Amino acid sequence: EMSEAIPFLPKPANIDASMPGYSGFDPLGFSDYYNVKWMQEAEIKHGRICMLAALGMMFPEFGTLPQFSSFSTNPLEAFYQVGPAGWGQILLFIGVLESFSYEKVFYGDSAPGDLGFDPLRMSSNAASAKHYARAEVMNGRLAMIGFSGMLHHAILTKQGPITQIVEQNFVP
């Protein structure tokens, strides 16, 4: 039995097709040492944060909130331009959200990523639930790569992604 992402390697033992984003990809064998469900929860959380982050590196170039209209369109400048009060409120809100994740991860036995947030019940249909389960992890990994790119490009150019693209500032 061989891995399906890397066809010349044996299939990793502790990752199965029941996991939503499975492709048989573990060449360094992380699943052989660490707790696989912990890595699933962590991958889902890193991906969700990067989905929000990849949207938010781009969105102030389209438009800003009217109270933040004087704030820079470079994300690494607008990070500082927000005062400590606004970042403290953001941190408090994230902490309130992560209290549920703390309870579920350290004291519960739910599925990885399951914080009970399905108000529209879009996982009621089984085939739709399978597609959404794979697609969340897929877009999360894509947003992880994309935000990594956007951050290091914003370090290099001191401007947002759309602005660097349309100015064609592609060389350091």
Partner 1 sequence: LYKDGVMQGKGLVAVPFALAPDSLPADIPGYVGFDPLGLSTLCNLDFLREAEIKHGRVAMLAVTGSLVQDVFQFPGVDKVIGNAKMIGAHDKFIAGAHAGDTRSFAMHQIIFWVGLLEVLTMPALFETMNGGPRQPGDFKFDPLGLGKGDKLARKQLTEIKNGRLAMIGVGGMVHHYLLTGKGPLQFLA
Partner 2 sequence: DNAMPFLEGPPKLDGSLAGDVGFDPVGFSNYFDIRWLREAELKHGRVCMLGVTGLLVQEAICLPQFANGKTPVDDFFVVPAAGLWQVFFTIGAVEFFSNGFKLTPGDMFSEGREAGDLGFDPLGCGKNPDALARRRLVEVKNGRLAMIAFGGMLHQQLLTGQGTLEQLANFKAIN
Ligand X SMILES: CCCCCCCCCCCCO[C@H]1O[C@H](CO)[C@@H](O[C@H]2O[C@H](CO)[C@@H](O)[C@H](O)[C@H]2O)[C@H](O)[C@H]1O
Gap between the Cα atoms of 74 and 31, Å rounded: 38
Gap between the Cα atoms of 17 and 31, Å rounded: 14
- DSSP H/E element including 130: helix 126-157
For residues 130-159, which are near ligand II0 according to CB under 6 A? 139, 142-143, 146, 149-150
Q: Is 96 in the site for ligand CLA (CB under 6 A)?
A: no
Gap between the Cα atoms of 159 and 144, Å rounded: 20
Gap between the Cα atoms of 106 and 102, Å rounded: 6
Q: Is 7 in the site for partner 1 (CB under 8 A)?
A: no
Quick one: 115 or 138, whose CB is closer to partner 1? 115
Asked if 141 and 135 touch (Cβ cutoff 8 Å), the reply is no
Taking CB under 8 A as the criterion, the residue among 17, 85, 127, 171 binding partner 2 is: 127
CB of 132 to ligand II0, least distance (A): 8
Question: Which residues lie near ligand CLA (CB under 6 A)?
Answer: 49, 52-53, 55-56, 59-60, 63-65, 68, 71, 78-79, 82-83, 85-86, 89-90, 93, 119, 145-146, 148-149, 152-153, 156-157, 169-172
